[PDB]
Design an enzyme around this catalytic site. Structure first.
Site, mmCIF file in Angstrom:
data_model
loop_
_atom_site.group_PDB
_atom_site.id
_atom_site.type_symbol
_atom_site.label_atom_id
_atom_site.label_comp_id
_atom_site.label_asym_id
_atom_site.label_seq_id
_atom_site.Cartn_x
_atom_site.Cartn_y
_atom_site.Cartn_z
ATOM 1 N N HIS A 40 0.808 -1.217 0.000
ATOM 2 C CA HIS A 40 0.000 0.000 0.000
ATOM 3 C C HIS A 40 0.842 1.268 0.000
ATOM 4 O O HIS A 40 0.268 2.357 -0.116
ATOM 5 C CB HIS A 40 -1.016 0.012 1.160
ATOM 6 C CG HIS A 40 -0.424 0.129 2.536
ATOM 7 N ND1 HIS A 40 -0.497 -0.891 3.457
ATOM 8 C CD2 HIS A 40 0.170 1.166 3.174
ATOM 9 C CE1 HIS A 40 0.064 -0.507 4.592
ATOM 10 N NE2 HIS A 40 0.476 0.739 4.445
ATOM 11 N N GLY A 141 3.010 5.543 10.627
ATOM 12 C CA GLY A 141 4.345 5.385 10.081
ATOM 13 C C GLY A 141 5.023 4.066 10.404
ATOM 14 O O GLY A 141 6.178 3.862 9.993
ATOM 15 N N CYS A 143 4.177 0.936 9.460
ATOM 16 C CA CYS A 143 4.038 -0.167 8.521
ATOM 17 C C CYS A 143 5.404 -0.563 7.969
ATOM 18 O O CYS A 143 6.292 0.270 7.772
ATOM 19 C CB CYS A 143 3.091 0.211 7.372
ATOM 20 S SG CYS A 143 1.350 0.187 7.914
HETATM 21 C C1 4WI Z 1 -5.841 2.342 11.306
HETATM 22 C C2 4WI Z 1 -6.405 2.890 9.988
HETATM 23 C C3 4WI Z 1 -7.819 3.456 10.237
HETATM 24 C C4 4WI Z 1 -5.507 4.026 9.485
HETATM 25 C C5 4WI Z 1 -6.471 1.794 8.907
HETATM 26 N N1 4WI Z 1 -7.191 0.603 9.351
HETATM 27 C C6 4WI Z 1 -8.138 0.091 8.566
HETATM 28 O O1 4WI Z 1 -8.491 0.619 7.514
HETATM 29 C C7 4WI Z 1 -8.763 -1.226 9.033
HETATM 30 F F1 4WI Z 1 -9.435 -1.056 10.135
HETATM 31 F F2 4WI Z 1 -9.566 -1.637 8.062
HETATM 32 F F3 4WI Z 1 -7.768 -2.197 9.255
HETATM 33 C C8 4WI Z 1 -5.073 1.261 8.530
HETATM 34 O O2 4WI Z 1 -4.461 0.517 9.292
HETATM 35 N N2 4WI Z 1 -4.599 1.629 7.340
HETATM 36 C C9 4WI Z 1 -5.236 2.495 6.326
HETATM 37 C C10 4WI Z 1 -4.475 2.261 5.032
HETATM 38 C C11 4WI Z 1 -3.213 1.446 5.384
HETATM 39 C C12 4WI Z 1 -3.246 1.182 6.888
HETATM 40 C C13 4WI Z 1 -2.281 1.979 7.559
HETATM 41 O O3 4WI Z 1 -2.384 3.201 7.562
HETATM 42 N N3 4WI Z 1 -1.312 1.333 8.244
HETATM 43 C C14 4WI Z 1 -0.276 2.052 9.027
HETATM 44 C C15 4WI Z 1 1.119 1.877 8.366
HETATM 45 N N4 4WI Z 1 2.048 2.847 8.535
HETATM 46 C C16 4WI Z 1 -0.231 1.455 10.452
HETATM 47 C C17 4WI Z 1 -1.434 1.881 11.310
HETATM 48 C C18 4WI Z 1 -1.439 3.408 11.445
HETATM 49 C C19 4WI Z 1 -2.174 3.549 12.779
HETATM 50 N N5 4WI Z 1 -1.669 2.361 13.527
HETATM 51 C C20 4WI Z 1 -1.266 1.444 12.631
HETATM 52 O O4 4WI Z 1 -0.819 0.336 12.947
HETATM 53 C C21 4WI Z 1 -4.280 0.828 4.482
HETATM 54 C C22 4WI Z 1 -5.100 -0.363 4.974
HETATM 55 C C23 4WI Z 1 -3.926 0.702 3.000
#
Ligand code: 4WI
Ligand code: 4WI
Lengths: 298, 297
Positions: A40, A141, A143
């Site tokens: 992503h 941040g 991921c």
């Molecule tokens: C939590 C949020 C509502 C933002 C969303 N969640 C859901 O959409 C779900 F609920 F469907 F999973 C979500 O994780 N993302 C939204 C977007 C990526 C991912 C994401 O931003 N990942 C972060 C990587 N840096 C790590 C996160 C940040 C907060 N704490 C973490 O660990 C993608 C799924 C493509």
């Protein structure tokens, strides 16, 4: 004492990089001439369903910036594998440790190196829960943060951080690009199954308690495994199996597993103000291996 | 979640120190290897005359190994409960660093080492009785405690002894044993541990920030009154309520409402949990809570 430790992170730290693409930054893992990271990173718009085939078809390699410490890496190609990207870079990471890749099974222990902006900030031991999520501390941040185990002088890479669920639970993928628990890297509501307490770990915990002189809860009645498992299915515990794996602990203590299964049933109602190695409730954080390693160094 | 800071900078400094039959860990910084002075003691089950042991020390009994390289010992001097062993080789991986002495209640990281090799890393707090809740077995001595701050490593702890209660005691790198404990194999008892009130308050604020608020009521308990209750019930006094004024503003919940909850909750959670815990938790500092949930130092 008994402390939940992480295995040392030095070997993994040298592999963490910052992966930037367009309007997103996250972490990658640089092994050999490949950087692994969540796919992503190339998604321009994450407020609705992502067509990853389309995002991949429009991906342009010049929009990547990959930073190891302060040095930029040259990007030469990038391929998509499940929910991961394998980005081919123009130099070999000369600090690549002896390594392999493994997919965690339910309940298995590993270590998380929590990274931000390509730099490690924390390290902790954790268990893959039965619902395929972990209780991490990940914020914006994080991921691409890697999960790992050290075994036989080799680093096993087992987890790449991907998403946080609405419950606050954390999901990642293997480095094969398979998301644990089949969750999707899509911004829609996803709910995990109910978590189960890991019976094998609670049993190991009670052995550790015996070995430390904490035995006020121990009684002489045994509860057969088949009868315990009938109770566990209805009370949110995993079933007992692999009883022979406890032989080293049963020998040192003289206490059979079935007496500890009986103890779990009673102590699940609460410790009544008492503590077992400092806890006010049953603990499933420690595996047999961790208890044997910490008590005996084996 | 209890975590540690990464261990990579410290790992490059751990070495194996052997003197005669005794093997433990040392910390190699610059051209000095720091380790516990009992590495040179001939018998560690009876009382030790360290001035005698130092006067009969023979430097050829030392072997010091970094990875698979041998270091050359050129001198050794004794400072408190530590030895400073001067070697010919400078550690080229010496990080930017300082030595600091921990205060009561302060959190830090332990790199648990055996045979000069790191085996585990975990966060701990220096407790009010100057012991830590570690996990060490034979050979762990010299394992270093550290904090990563402002682009440097602060070295704060060198592991020394396990008390009969299982509590662990170390020294600073200036050779001062925390708590005034002796590096002697005699019965020494620690004083009673107190719950760190400031950490309990941080835990309760973390519970509020996670919407776990079943326990939160509207009554306030004044700081002076709480402290009178705390001195008699095994809690430290509340101090520096100003650092919590950032969280008080953010949650809209004053510290006085949390002090009242501590007094109530100290009698038990009645089957409920707070962030998954069945009793009050003093393991998390305000620093940790804020770092883990807001990303700031
Ligand atoms: C939590 C949020 C509502 C933002 C969303 N969640 C859901 O959409 C779900 F609920 F469907 F999973 C979500 O994780 N993302 C939204 C977007 C990526 C991912 C994401 O931003 N990942 C972060 C990587 N840096 C790590 C996160 C940040 C907060 N704490 C973490 O660990 C993608 C799924 C493509
Ligand atoms: C626990 C033991 C009964 C052995 C003893 N304790 C007491 O004498 C006391 F209780 F008084 F503290 C004790 O710690 N030591 C005996 C001897 C050194 C020290 C010692 O062995 N340090 C180990 C370093 N490798 C630390 C690890 C910690 C876990 N278990 C260990 O052994 C000296 C005090 C000179």
């Amino acid at each position: 004492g008994l402390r939940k430790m992480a295995q040392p992170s030095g070997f993994v730290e040298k592999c963490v990089v910052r992966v930037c693409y367009g309007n997103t930054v996250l972490n990658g893992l640089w092994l050999g001439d490949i950087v692994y990271c969540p796919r992503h990173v190339i998604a321009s718009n994450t407020t609705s369903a992502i067509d990853y085939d389309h995002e991949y078809s429009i991906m342009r390699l010049h929009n990547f910036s990959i930073i190891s410490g302060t040095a930029f890496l040259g990007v030469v190609g990038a391929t998509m594998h499940g929910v991961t990207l394998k980005i081919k870079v123009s130099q070999t990471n000369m600090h690549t440790p002896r390594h392999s890749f493994r997919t965690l099974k339910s309940g298995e222990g590993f270590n998380i190196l929590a990274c931000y902006d390509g730099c490690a900030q924390g390290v902790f031991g954790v268990n893959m829960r039965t619902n395929w999520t972990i209780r991490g501390s990940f914020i914006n941040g994080a991921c691409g943060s890697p999960g790992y185990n050290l075994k036989n002088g080799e680093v096993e890479f087992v987890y790449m951080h991907q998403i946080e669920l609405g419950s606050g639970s954390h999901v990642g993928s293997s480095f094969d690009g398979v998301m644990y628990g089949g969750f999707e890297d899509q911004p829609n509501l996803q709910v995990e199954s109910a978590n189960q307490m890991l019976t094998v770990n609670v049993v190991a915990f009670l052995y550790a308690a015996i070995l430390n002189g904490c035995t006020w809860w121990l009684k002489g009645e045994k509860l057969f495994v088949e009868h315990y498992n009938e109770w566990a299915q209805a009370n949110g515990f995993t079933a007992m199996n692999g009883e022979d794996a406890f032989s080293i602990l049963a020998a040192k203590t003289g206490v059979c597993v079935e007496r500890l299964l009986h103890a779990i049933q009673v102590l699940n109602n609460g410790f009544g103000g008492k503590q077992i190695l400092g806890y006010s409730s049953l603990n499933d954080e420690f595996s047999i291996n961790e208890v044997v390693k910490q008590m005996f160094g084996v």
